[PDB]
Swiss-Prot record:
Spans annotated as NMP: 30-59
Record GO cellular component, one term: cytoplasm
Gene Ontology molecular functions: adenylate kinase activity; ATP binding; zinc ion binding
Presence of the UniProt keyword Metal-binding in the record: yes
Organism: Geobacillus stearothermophilus
Pathway it works in: Purine metabolism; AMP biosynthesis via salvage pathway; AMP from ADP: step 1/1
Cross-referenced HAMAP family: Adenylate_kinase_Adk
Protein name: Adenylate kinase
Taxonomic classification: Bacteria, Bacillati, Bacillota, Bacilli, Bacillales
Catalysed transformations (reactions): AMP + ATP = 2 ADP
């Protein structure tokens, strides 16, 4: 299963990714994760990226496409993969089509997790993620068993620097602007599918699973 998740910041892409990866054992490729790792490690790309992320802006396309091209070629992606929050622009999506054509791993479905903007500030400011394994929690909607401790590795949870009210408002604007063109791109391709992301996380996952059920695992 060769999959893309798309959706606004806070829509639940990571939360569903965790469940898809657990159930199907495919690699999770998250450009935000990659950029945050590089930033933590202090690499030149991480430091460049940090500037955009801190503002809530997108990292430029070509560097982003580069890291994805490199990632997607690995042997662990032979039996499927899950792209989470890439592509984010039409240019990214056009480059991805070429990339997948070259290695013979074309997309099965793009899954649009649809959430209205007026619930996303509360989703993002109460988001808490594990420092070690990146497991996602929410202080209201999905708290850990023990406060501040990841249920999966027992790591400490933290608040992403970009999940602050001002940067959230920028991220929503910047990504909303990219959405209609990117949705139209894939709608024209024919394999865009929508999932209502304003349901309990389990019900959202049920809808995702039922869509994936036509694919080989
Ligand atoms: N391709 C690209 N090109 C250019 N730049 C790029 C790029 N990719 C990354 N970047 C750069 O990197 C930055 C960060 O990218 P990124 O890390 O991808 O952050 P984002 O794009 O801001 O998306 P999030 O990861 O913010 O949201 P999500 O949809 O995963 O939601 P979650 O499941 O966590 O859920 C949110 C919260 O709500 C909760 N929740 C989840 N589902 C539900 C539900 N059904 N009900 C209630 N609460 C829920 C969760 O527990 C959690 O607390 C970008 O801003 C940009 O600078
Ligand atoms: Mg994410
Ligand atoms: Zn953890």
């Amino acid at each position: 299963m060769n999959l893309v998740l798309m959706g606004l910041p806070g829509a639940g892409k990571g939360t569903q990714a965790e469940r898809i990866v657990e159930a199907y054992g495919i690699p999770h490729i998250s450009t935000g994760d990659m950029f945050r790792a590089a930033m933590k490690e202090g690499t030149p790309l991480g430091l460049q990226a940090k500037q955009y992320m801190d503002r809530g802006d997108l990292v430029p396309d070509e560097v982003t496409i580069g890291i994805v091209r490199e990632r997607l070629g690995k042997d662990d992606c032979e039996r499927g993969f899950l792209l989470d929050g890439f592509p984010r622009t039409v240019a990214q999506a056009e480059a991805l089509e070429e990339i997948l054509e070259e290695i013979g791993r074309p997309i099965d479905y793009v899954i649009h997790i649809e959430v209205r903007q007026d619930v996303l500030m509360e989703r993002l400011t109460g988001r808490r993620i594990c420092r070690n394994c990146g497991a996602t929690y929410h202080l209201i909607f999905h708290p850990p068993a023990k406060p501040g401790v990841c249920d999966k590795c027992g790591g400490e949870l933290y608040q992403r620097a970009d999940d602050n009210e001002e940067t959230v408002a920028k991220r929503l604007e910047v990504n909303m602007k990219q959405m209609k063109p990117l949705l139209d791109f894939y709608e024209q391709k024919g394999y865009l599918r929508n999932v209502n992301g304003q349901q309990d996380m389990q019900d959202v996952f049920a809808d995702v699973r039922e869509l994936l059920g036509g694919l080989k695992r």
